[PDB]
Amino acid sequence: QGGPVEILPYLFLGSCSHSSDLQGLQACGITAVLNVSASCPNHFEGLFRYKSIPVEDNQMVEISAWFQEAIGFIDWVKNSGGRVLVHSQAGISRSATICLAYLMQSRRVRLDEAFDFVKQRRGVISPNFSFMGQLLQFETQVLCH
Template identity: 45%
Template sequence: MQQNDICYVLNASNTCPKPDFIPESHFLRVPVNDSFCEKILPWLDKSVDFIAKASNGHVLVHCLAGISRSATIAIAYIMKRMDMSLDEAYRFVKEKRPTISPNFNFLGQLLDFEKKIKNQSGQPGHISKRKLLHLEKSTLGIKPFLWFH
C-alpha cells in the first residue's frame, strides 16, 4: 500500500484489521455485511465525506472480495461528488473494475441515495461532468476495490 501512496483506508467489513501504519484519522470502518438485509445507506454520506477529505492522498476502499460493499461505496462517491446518476456512476465504476456486482439490497439503497442527492442538488462540492475527463487522467486520487489477502 505504501508503494502506491495509499494513506487513507476505508474498510467495508467487520473483520479486516486496520493497517498499523495508517493513523486512526486516516481510517474508516464501515461495519456492514454483504447481505440482503444489511443497511449500508446510513454509512454512504460518511464514506463519501471520508474519501473527499483525503483529496491530498490515495484512498484504498476495500471489503473482502471487492465486488459488492466497496463497489457500492465507490458508486455512491461518484454519484455525489461527480453529480452522476446511479446508472452513470455504476457504468463508470464497472468500466474501471468489471467484476463489481453490488447486491440487490445495496442497489436499492443506492436508488434511495440518488433521490436524496437530487433533493440536495446545487450543494457545493459537486464536480461537474466536464471535469471528469481531467479527473480520470489524474486517477481521481481514489483506488477503489483493492483488498487484503
C-alpha cells in the first residue's frame, strides 16, 4: 500500500506512472516544479518557478549531492514560492528522497521519522532491507552539515 508520495499540502512528490495525474493536477495550480532531469541547478519559470536538478545515469543516481539542493529548493519554495512538486525519472523513490532531506533539515526528524512520515513502510532502495545502521550518517549530513 504505497507509491505516490506527498508531504503536507505544500510539498508533493511522485514516483511511477502516478506522477502523471499528480504532476498534472498540481500543474494546473503549481508554483515550483522540481524537474529532476539535468542542466544542473537551473532556475527557469515556464509557468512560475522551474527547478532543475542534475541527474545521472548509473545504478540509481547517487542522491548524496542533492542534500543542500533539495532543502534549499523545497524550503525556498515553501518560504516564498508556494507548492513544490518533485518529479521522477526511473519509477524510483529518488524524488521522495529529496523531500526527505527537506523534512530532515527543516523538520529535524532524520531519515527515521522523515521516511516514516512521507509514507508507510515497504519501499527500500538499494541493498538496505532488514537493517537499521543508516541513521547518524544522513542526520549529520543533512542536519549538522
